[PDB]
Design a protein around this nucleic acid. Structure first.
Lengths: 138, 138
DNA sequence: CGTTA
DNA sequence: CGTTA
């Protein structure tokens, strides 16, 4: 009944939907999620609003609003740079980190769900076949 | 070796890549493709630049530039509305239509490629299993 | 987004 | 986009 194109598109759609749904359960928007995820990946650096704006490709006022909201939840903290009064550095709080890790947990959760649908032998065959299909598109 | 998450993501990636590649062969950008596709879907209406801007969620100057380029190739034509001097209607030319249909042909082409990778019996099983996996995410 | 980009 | 959103 279904074409492969429909199935692959729909599977991807639902995987995205699950992620969206996880963000909703954590009371954050997609964009807030992206901001926190980028902070997570660059915790070591000492990031500013401008860095985030460039990375997310969003205007300054938009990132200011996002950060204001994230800080109001204390998922982030901001402080004046000791060498530059005009610069505010941004970090994740303990809870910010926990929220990001809770969000990203959904990837393995979905993998585990997909894997549990088939017998071990069926999974091996399915992966082989998907691997062949993937090759045929390359 | 590969997770299902990697395979489904990569298959979707390549399918998108094939579409991009088709646009390149037809000498149009993604955005130009989107504009022509929207015109195709609304050939019956008498569309203006403003309609297209709202639909594509792009600024007016951007759509003006897109239309200028599409018209320079004569993939579209524009004319002053007989009831409103300030309004220009936009239509696809014969070649504009042919280009869109050539682009969208790539969907069935990829479906046919995917289907040809497996025996008939294997395709039935694969589709069944993908259908189960899709359900498990719903 | 148009259609499944 | 961060990581696979």
């Amino acid at each position: 009944e279904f074409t492969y194109s429909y199935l692959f598109r729909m599977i991807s759609h639902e995987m995205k939907q699950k992620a969206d749904q996880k963000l909703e359960q954590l009371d954050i928007t997609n964009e807030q999620g992206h901001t926190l995820g980028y902070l997570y990946a660059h915790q070591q650096d000492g990031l500013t609003q401008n860095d985030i704006a460039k990375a997310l490709q969003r205007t300054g006022p938009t990132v200011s609003n996002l950060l204001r909201n994230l800080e109001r939840k204390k998922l982030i903290y901001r402080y004046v740079d000791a060498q530059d009064t005009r610069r505010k550095n941004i970090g994740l709080t303990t809870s910010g980190i926990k929220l990001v890790e809770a969000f990203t947990s959904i990837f393995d959760e979905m993998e585990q769900t997909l894997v549990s649908q088939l017998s071990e032998e069926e999974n091996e065959q399915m992966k082989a076949n998907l691997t062949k299909m993937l090759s045929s598109l390359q």
